[PDB]
Amino acid sequence: TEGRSRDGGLRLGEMERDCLIGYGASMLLLERLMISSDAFEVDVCGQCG
Amino acid sequence: AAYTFNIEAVGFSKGEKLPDVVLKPPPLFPDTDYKPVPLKTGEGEEYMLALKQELRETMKRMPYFIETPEERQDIERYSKRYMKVYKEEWIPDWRRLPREMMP
Amino acid sequence: TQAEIKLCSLLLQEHFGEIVEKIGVHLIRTGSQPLRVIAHDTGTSLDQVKKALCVLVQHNLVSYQVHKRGVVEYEAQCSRVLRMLRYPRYIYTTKTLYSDTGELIVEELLLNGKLTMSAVVKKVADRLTETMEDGKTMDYAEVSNTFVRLADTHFVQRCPSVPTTENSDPGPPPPAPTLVINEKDMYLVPKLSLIGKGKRRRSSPIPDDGIYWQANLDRFHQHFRDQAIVSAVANRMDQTSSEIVRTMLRMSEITTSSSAPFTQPLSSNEIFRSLPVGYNISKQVLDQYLTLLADDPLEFVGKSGDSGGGMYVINLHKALASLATATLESVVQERFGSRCARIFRLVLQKKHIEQKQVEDFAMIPAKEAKDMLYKMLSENFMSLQEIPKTPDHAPSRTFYLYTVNILSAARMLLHRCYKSIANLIERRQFETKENKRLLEKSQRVEAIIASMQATGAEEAQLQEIEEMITAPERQQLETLKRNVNKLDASEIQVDETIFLLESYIECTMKRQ
Amino acid sequence: MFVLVEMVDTVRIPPWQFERKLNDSIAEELNKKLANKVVYNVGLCICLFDITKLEDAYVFPGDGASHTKVHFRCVVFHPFLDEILIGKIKGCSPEGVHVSLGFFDDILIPPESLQQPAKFDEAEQVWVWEYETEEGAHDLYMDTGEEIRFRVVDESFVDTSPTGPSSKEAPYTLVGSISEPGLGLLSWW
Amino acid sequence: MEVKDANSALLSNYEVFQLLTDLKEQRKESGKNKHSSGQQNLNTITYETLKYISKTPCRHQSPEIVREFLTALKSHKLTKAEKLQLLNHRPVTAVEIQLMVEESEERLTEEQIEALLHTVTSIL
Amino acid sequence: KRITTPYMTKYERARVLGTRALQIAMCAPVMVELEGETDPLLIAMKELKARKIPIIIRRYLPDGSYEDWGVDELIITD
Amino acid sequence: GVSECIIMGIPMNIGTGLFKLLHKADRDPNPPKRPLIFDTNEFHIPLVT
Amino acid sequence: QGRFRGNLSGKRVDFSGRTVISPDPNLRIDEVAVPVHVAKILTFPEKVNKANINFLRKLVQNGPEVHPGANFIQQRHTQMKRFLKYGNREKMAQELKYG
RNA sequence: ACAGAG
DNA sequence: TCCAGCTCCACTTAA
DNA sequence: TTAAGTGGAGCTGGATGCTCTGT
Structure with missing residues (x-):
């Protein structure tokens, strides 16, 4: 959630994504923006898509 | 409850008689008032119906009807010569056809 | 034209198969293609493309033209494949003007696409050995006598034939030899002194080489063009006013083209002569009809002339x-x-x-x-x-x-018909797919009757046919056949709705 | 009666099994997923015969395990049509003779393909056979399971897959015949 | 997973008699883990197969028996549906050769059929 | 011959230490003699200094070809 | 590209995501096979001509 | 505040903290002093293996209140987490497995 | 929606 | 509050 | 005389920084 009153948590912005790419950190960019927010699984049909 | 659009722009100037709300959806097959015209009968219209069955029974047996090639047969045996589906082979006129199609 | 592509994948399926429609429909769908990209854009072997194009160029369903670098590109014809549904309407309408000999001549031309005059008179002599008995043979002569009368009324025309390579371009072989059609000998048959007798299927050097005959599917449409116009005149006034339209159109056969708003106007002094003699009508009563048909605001006919007594034309496109x-x-x-x-x-x-x-x-x-x-x-x-x-x-x-x-609204109503026929073919191929259990059961109990029918056939195999459990099952097989007789007959009758629409769309297209 | 079937796979080897040789650890993992299981079009997979080609062992990001692609041949019980085996009896029923074949249990010898003198039992589950001179209508296929001889005339596969959202029939059937001379108990011939 | 071939070869039941014996030679060095059925499905399908093989006449053969049995059987003009069953099923009488070999009384002479009673039993 | 550079980059060092630390975190064998260190990344750095990590870096040239380099045969540095 | 690997949650190709790590396993590729005894080529010449 | 700038390219993460800063030169140039109130909340999943088992037993036995401690525990093939304040901790430390 | 803070 | 595309209309050459 | 390819003028649709901290 958003703010301190809601126990919100902090935001990887649009510019701190641009700094982790400059280091070439690929798995750290994956761990911050996929695993530690909203990791999920989906039933994808490989036939029709 | 009032909506985003103006109902007065749509209509309903009296203020009553809103259209009813559907509870159970309509079926897949609404019944019709009218029915199709029956078939044209006669001795001349029936012979075309007879020959059309005599084309599916004829054109499936023709050598143009290329059947799909069989594969992944299990093993060989002696019951193969009895079950070999014999059918003659037709050669085209290669003077008409291009050179690029010889077997 | 999504309905035409679905119907062509059905017409090539029952009449030609499964591994041949993938080559034909893909040319209707995509366009002009060389032979190597047909296999790549379908996924079939290179051998099956050699088998599936030689059948489609046999029946003249695909054509070709020479391009840059000598490549051979094919092109299927959408309207020509859709006329495989009117095959029983083409065999029946030659049973009227010609006998049972000529009924089986066109039926060999339509099922085989292209035949020679040496081969087609053989099979009509062969297949009519079953229709006769007591030693009477069908001879090669009178079949040709019906065949040369077919070419006179333009129901059978010559194919676009191969040219002479010794006169045009000698040397290295071209891939596609640029076939061409001539105007003089479309109906000029080669002379045949050969005769003979057909074989009765007992089961126990060519003069017309290159001269191929194919069916003229335009002439049957011009023959169906007249019977739609005459019956429209017939229902309004009289049978006597019906024959007058039939009198001019049979004279207007060989004098006008397939797309003309106006034919050659006929003088009434020769209309009276070509009118049949069994009608009690004078020349004055003939001039009574021809001035009142032009007065009808339906305007089937027009005046269009004054010289030579009564000069009269008939409209086609109106x-x-x-x-x-x-x-x-x-x-x-x-x-x-x-x-x-x-x-x-x-x-x-x-x-x-x-x-x-x-x-x-x-x-x-x-x-x-x-x-x-x-x-x-x-x-x-x-x-x-x-x-x-x-x-x-x-x-x-x-x-x-x-x-x-x-x-x-004439193209849209025709588009309703192309989906309508394909839905009838899908229903027939549904009830026959789900009931191949019953038809094989009707096949096996009749195979006891069929196999060993006369040779060593005892009478202890006649009562054991109905012994199988198919006897209460026969109620469904009569329900299956009464559906097919209403499906395939309705499948033919929609072509009447097509042809009145197809002729009106064809006459308003200029193709400029 | 055994055949080979060639398949491909991607085998996850967890990192607590790196002390052991890879070929000794691939073969155990493939038998944990294929043994006593009917792969659909090929028959009952007994065990692995040999591993024929072993590619490189990638380590993908997000895991410590190594994934390698395995080409391998599996010995599979699949008899060809009309192969004559020897089999045992478990029991009988009006639906036919239920023949056991060691590890496998679903063999159909139907009354439509039994022997011609006796076809319908006298409301007994055990099937019968009638001969005129000796043992008239009292012969029986005994439930103790003596060896018979039969001929597998028909085999048929069914797709046993989940139909519907996920929160016991046999996918490998076998139909035989006994009517030939020489097919039946070994005590008769 | 993906499947390449429905039918690759034809194995006699002697080649798996040696295989499941050699599979027992390395087994029972480690008990089952009871983390899954990973050793449950394997053990009952190796044992109950090898018990049924140990009652076939495929026992007491050798690789150099199977090679020499197919050596003498090479010229008798039999198929792979027939050369497979003569090794593993041990014909001893004349009623089973009519079943293992189709059209047995029409292709093979009665002296040559009775030779197959001697050709099988003198090797196994 | 192998034509790419023989110096290990910082990205190869980072991902080799990452994969080897995640493999030490799960119960894999340790190729060196550890002396009480509990963090898996420190043990991976001991295995990197002692040249004992069993990883083969697969360098991809962008045409499709590849080059197998061992970790213990690149010139590692700070 | 980079900005559509971050949305789809797959690791990017630049930085540490450009090379693959293999595992130096003690393994025998293309190992000694088991010999086929019955079905060889020299004993099973087919019957038909 | 759309999807492509608000929820896809940059998104709100957890295991984070934000506090006022203040100088300290007695640390090295690659160190940072995390307060105790943030270090008790921000946790790290330390997988149990042969090296750290006797360290993690003590970090479980301290519990969620004494600072070198643990806030959760999780079994091998299970996806639930047992909150370590309730129950006996010296039993859950003697029942740790590899993994 | 407004005010702050860096 | 600032800036590229899209469409309408006179303006010469050329037959 | 006019068909046509290309200039210039007005209309249109898009965009304008990163977070926490409260009412």
Whole structure:
């Protein structure tokens, strides 16, 4: 959630994504923006898509 | 409850008689008032119906009807010569056809 | 044309197979292709493309032209494959003007695409050995006597034949030899002194080399063009006024082209002669008919001349417009009722009309006509014009004029038919797919009758046929056959709805 | 009666099994997923015969395990049509003779393909056979399971897959015949 | 997973008699883990197969028996549906050769059929 | 011959230490003699200094070809 | 590209995501096979001509 | 505040903290002093293996209140987490497995 | 929606 | 509050 | 005389920084 009153948590912005790419950190960019927010699984049909 | 659009722009100037709300959806097959015209009968219209069955029974047996090639047969045996589906082979006129199609 | 592509994948399926329609439909769908990209854009082996194109170039369903770098590109014909449905209508209409000999001549030309004159008179002599008995043989001579009469009335024409390579381009072989059609010898048969007898199937050096014969599918359409116009004249006035139209059109066969708004006008002094002698009619009564048919605002005929006594012509494209008019109104009466078809004929004559004038001119009230007005625009039978007052085009400051467009409703109604036939083929191929259990069960119990029928056939195999459990199952097999006789017969009758629509669309296209 | 079937796979080897040789750890993992299981079009997979080609062992990001692609041949019980085996009896029923074949249990010897003198039992589950001179209508296929001889005339596969959202029939059937001379109990011939 | 071939070869039941014996030679060095059925499905399908093989006449053969049995059987003009069953099923009488070999009384002479009673039993 | 550079980059060092630390975190064998360190990344750095990590870096040239380099045969540095 | 690997949650190609790590396993590729005894080529010449 | 700038390219993460800063030169140039109130909340999943088992037993036995402690525990093939304040911790430390 | 803070 | 595309209309050459 | 390819003028649709901290 958003703010301190809601126990919100902090935001990887649009510019701190641009700094982790400059280091070439690929798995750290994956761990911050996929695993530690909203990791999920989906039933994808490989036939029709 | 009032909506985003103006109902007065749509209509309903009296203020009553809103259209009813559907509870159970309509079926897949609404019944019709009218029915199709029956078939044209006669001795001349029936012979075309007879020959059309005599084309599916004829054109499936023709050598143009290329059947799909069989594969992944299990093993060989002696019951193969009895079950070999014999059918003659037709050669085209290669003077008409291009050179690029010889077997 | 998504309906035409679905129907062509059915017509190539029952009549040619499964691994041959993938090559034919893909040329209707995509376009002109060399042989190597046909296999790549389908996924088949290179051998099967050699088998599936040689059958489609046999029956003249695909054509080809030479391009840059000598490549050979194919092209399928969409209208030519759709006329494989009218094959029983082509065999029956030659049974009228020709005998049972000529009925099996075209039937060998349509099933095999191209034949030689040496081969086609053989099989008609062969297949009519079953129709006779007691030593009487069918000879090669009288089949040719019917065959040369077929070419006189243009029902059988020569193929575009291969040219002479010794006269044109000698040397290295070209891939596609650029076939060409001549104007003189389309109907000039080669002479044959050869005769003989057909074999009765006992089961126990060529003069016409290169001269191939194929069926003229245009002449049967010109033969079906006359029977639609004459029967339209027949139902209105009289059988006596019907034959006069039949008199001119049989004379107008060899003198006009396939797409002409006006034929050559006929003088009445030779109409009286070519009219059959069994009619009690004078030359004066002949001039009575020809001035009142031109007075009809249907205008089947026109005057168009004054010299040589009574000079008279017959319209072709205006007549097909009247046939497509009666086609487009006979579908409104059966789907939306008789009173709804009153309005479609009103907006047809009174060309541009509003809501207030329809309820006056037809005596159909408010809240009964407005349902029948709105269900026709929703089915694309009637259009609007929407003349504005302002360039804002607001619906509160404009008029709405209902307007019937015939030609856009003539293509759409034809598009309804192409899906309609394919739905009939899918229903027949559904009930035959789910019931191959029962038909094999009817096959095996009759195989005891079929195999060992006479040779060593005892009488202790006649009572054991109905012993299997198929005897109460026979109620479903009679239900299966009565469905097929209503499906395949309705499958033919929609081609009558097509041909009146197909002729009206063909005569209004200029192809410039 | 055994055949080979060639398949491909991607085998996850967890990192607590790196002390052991890879070929000794691939073969155990493939038998944990294929043994006593009917792969659909090929028959009952007994065990692995040999591993024929072993590619490189990638380590993908997000895991410590190594994934390698395995080409391998599996010995599979699949008899060809009309192969004559020897089999045992488990029990009988009006639906036919239920023949056991060691590890496998679903063999159909139907009454439509039994021997001609006796076809319908006397409301007994055990099937019968009638001979005129000796043992008239009292012969029986004994439930103790003596060895018979039969001929597998028909085999048929069914797709046993989940139909519907996920929160016991046999996918490998076998139909035989006994009517030939020499097919039946070994005590008769 | 993806499947390449429905039918690759034909194995006699002697080649798996040696295989499941050699599979027992390395087994029972480690008990089952009871983390899954990973050793449950394997053990009952190796044992109950090898018990049924140990009652076939495929026992007491050798690789150099199977090679020499197919050596003498090479010229008798039999198929792979027939050369497979003569090794593993041990014909001893004349009623089973009519079943293992189709059209047995029409292709093979009665002296040559009775030779197959001697050709099988003198090797196994 | 192998034509790419023989110096280990910082990205190869980072991902080799990452994969080897995640493999030490799960119960894999340790190729060196650990002396009480509990963090898996420190043990991976001991295995990197002692040249004992069993990883083969697969360098991809962008045409499709590849080059197998061992970790213990690149010139590692700070 | 980079900005559509971050949305789809797959690791990017630049930085540490450009090379693959293999595992130096003690393994025998293309190992000694088991010999086929019955079905060889020299004993099973087919019957048909 | 759309999807492509608000929820896809940059998104709100957890295991984070934000506090006022203040100088300290007695640390090295690659160190940072995390307060105790943030270090008790921000946790790290330390997988149990052969090296750290006797360290993690003590970090479980301290519990969620004494600072070198643990806030959760999780079994091998299970996806639930047992909150370590309730129950006996010296039993859950003697029942740790590899993994 | 507004005010702050860096 | 600032800046590229899209469409309408006169303006010469050329037959 | 006019068909046509290309200039110039007005209309249109898009965009304008990163977070926490409260009411």
